[PDB]
Amino acid sequence: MVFYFTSSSVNSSAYTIYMGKDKYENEDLIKHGWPEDIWFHVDKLSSAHVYLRLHKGENIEDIPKEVLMDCAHLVKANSIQGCKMNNVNVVYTPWSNLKKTADMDVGQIGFHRQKDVKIVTVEKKVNEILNRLEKTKVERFPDLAAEKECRDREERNEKKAQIQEMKKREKEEMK
Template sequence: MVFYFKARPDSGDYTIFMGLDKHENEELIKYGFIEDIWGFDPTSSPTKVEVHAIPMRLGNKVNNVDVVYTPWQNLKKTASMEVGQVGFHNPKMVRTVRVEKRINEIVNRLNKTKVERKPDLKAEREAVNAAERAERKQHLREKKRREDLEKLDKERQADLRSYKNLMVAEKMTSNKEIASTNKSLQELEEDFM
């Protein structure tokens, strides 16, 4: 079971994901997204906070709690770690915020937006990956098309500036042909002009 909360609707539409326990959080860790920010009390399970971090621990009944925040891609999971346990690739990307006192109005506001779901996180991640791949392919096709059009345009411009089409045998007239027309020199000059 995963709990979903809407946070800070006044400054943007942010979603907080929270696993029921460390097993659900393990799935959230495994199928996270690059834009995710993770926030958790180091003494408990991590909570996935999408896009924006809220400096508080849901359901925490104590004061003076440190909340650790880091981007999802900074989470480090090794085979020797317990379920729900994570480390960090780069400690410089980790921020700790001390929550001095639980603010009930924030917790109550978040709890009003609480939704419980049993998502297929793997399928959601695969769908997003497929959409991203399709978008990249579309951009590559568009880029290739633009490059091909630019190449054709450059070739056309080069042909226009080139003299190769001026001296084509089919467009040339010999002096014998001109003489056979029985035109006077003045008529030939007028035709030329």
């Protein structure tokens, strides 16, 4: 079972956040995450792994601050010791930067490059973020392999689409 929350930004676009129930659902959230996903975790402390899926064409450095603080506060509330602390740091990196090896545990994750691992300090505990975020809480039991290859199929259909309209243009250029 995976939890899904909705983070609304300033430009009235809804961002999808998801969070596994325990370590084993998150093993498959690591295995089947999308390139549009941004992984959030409390730095230097035990916590859950929060994920934020961006829109097509969006980058990690272009995340609205409200959404970034929604993910940060959400991942801090679901930390055993981070939730009771006032000031915590949250590392977040693109899903494509996560590295999982055989020598690793369940829940333990590595990085391909610490250069694309970013930091943000959540300085306090605000309850409206978590209340608003849970009022949008939907619980699903998804088959993430199939969903991720629906994303891959969608991307392939867009690339073939652009290929077919660029052959349309290059052929109709000759009138």
